[PDB]
Design a protein around this ligand. Structure first.
Ligand SMILES: [Cu+2]
Length: 124
C-alpha cells in the first residue's frame, strides 16, 4: 500500500507540521513525504528507528518515497524546522518492539511534544 505525508508551513496542529503526524503502515508499504510548501525535508531522528532500519534524509523540496520494511516506530523530522517541532511518527506493523527506546530518545521540547502526541495517537 502507498501512503502520503505532507510537510506544511501550517496546519491544524500549528506551524511547521507533518500531516498526518502519525501513520500506521504494514511492513513493505511505502510512504511518500511531500514538501507541499517550500523549505522542508524528511530525516530520521537519531535514536528513533528500529533495528534493521536505515537512516534517511531527503533533499529540501524533494518528494521522497520510503519503503518501510523493518517493524517498529520511526520518528522523523524536517531538518530545518526540528527545533520548532516539525516531526512525525510512522509505525510499521503492530506491537512495535522499539517503543521504549523511541520514547527515551532526546528531542527539542517542541519536537518531543508533537512526538509524544503522535505516539499517543497511535495508541501507544
Ligand atoms: Cu521544514
Amino acid at each position: 500500500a502507498d501512503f502520503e505525508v505532507h510537510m506544511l508551513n501550517k496546519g491544524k496542529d500549528g506551524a511547521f507540521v507533518f500531516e498526518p503526524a502519525s501513520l500506521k503502515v504494514a511492513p513493505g508499504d511505502t510512504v511518500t513525504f511531500i514538501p507541499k510548501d517550500k523549505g522542508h525535508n524528511v530525516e530520521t531522528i537519531k535514536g528513533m528507528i528500529p533495528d534493521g532500519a536505515e537512516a534517511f534524509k531527503s533533499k529540501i523540496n524533494e518528494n521522497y518515497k520510503v519503503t518501510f520494511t523493518a517493524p517498529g516506530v520511526y520518528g522523523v523530522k524536517c531538518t530545518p524546522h526540528y527545533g520548532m517541532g516539525m516531526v512525525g511518527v510512522v509505525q510499521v506493523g503492530d506491537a512495535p518492539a522499539n517503543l521504549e527506546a523511541v520514547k527515551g530518545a532526546k528531542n527539542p521540547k517542541k519536537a518531543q511534544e508533537r512526538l509524544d502526541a503522535a505516539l499517543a495517537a497511535l495508541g501507544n
